[PDB]
Amino acid sequence: NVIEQNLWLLGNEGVIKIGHRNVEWKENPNAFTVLRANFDRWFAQEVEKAGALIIPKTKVEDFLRNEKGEIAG
């Protein structure tokens, strides 16, 4: 849980740290750091529990079209 957001101005040997730590972000969070293979695999499990069929290992190449010429799948 991100409670401090810094901006660092790196020099040749120094750094100007301009941070902002807030302690209400400890109980009402603003942001979390994530690793997206850990987040989107969990987020897929909630989408799967919601009732969606997630089909991995499958690359979409094009769209199947009806004779109206629009994207039908």
Partner: protein
């Protein structure tokens, strides 16, 4: 962003996330924009499923929800942001390394009588860039931040 995004809608088709180029990279809000764009597209299709129409008459509401929310207003704001940063090459080339040597000279104690560190900082900042370049660059970026 705003100058380069596609048409985010069409006949039975919507476009979300980075595919619609919805990223506020200076604030690092791309997943902020992506998770919202999924919510706006899914609420557009839920309007499209009760009516049964999926053409550009009903699916244009996704582009209406995209600018009635924060996603396209953050893109209009930092619209000419990186072309502003491309035409200086100063804010990451002299400006950090000069603010470090100035604040190091400000905290260095070497028997220099604090007017000759207030002018050595002025001899530091007005040597790598003129004062007509410093006072210009604070509001030349002001047009990038709007």
């Amino acid at each position: 962003g705003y100058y380069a995004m596609p048409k985010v809608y069409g006949d039975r088709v919507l476009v979300c996330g980075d595919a619609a180029m919805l990223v506020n990279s200076i604030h690092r809000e791309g997943s902020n924009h992506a998770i919202t764009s999924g919510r706006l597209a899914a609420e557009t299709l839920l309007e499209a499923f009760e009516k049964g129409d999926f053409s550009e008459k009903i699916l244009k509401n996704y582009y209406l929800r995209l600018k009635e929310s924060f996603i396209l207003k953050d893109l209009e704001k930092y619209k000419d942001l990186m072309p502003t940063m491309e035409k200086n090459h100063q804010f990451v080339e002299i400006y950090p390394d000069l603010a470090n040597d100035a604040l190091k000279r400000f905290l260095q104690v070497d028997g220099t009588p604090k007017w000759d560190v207030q002018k050595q900082i002025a001899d530091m900042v007005l040597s790598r860039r003129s004062l007509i370049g410093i006072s210009l660059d604070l509001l030349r970026f002001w047009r990038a931040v709007r």
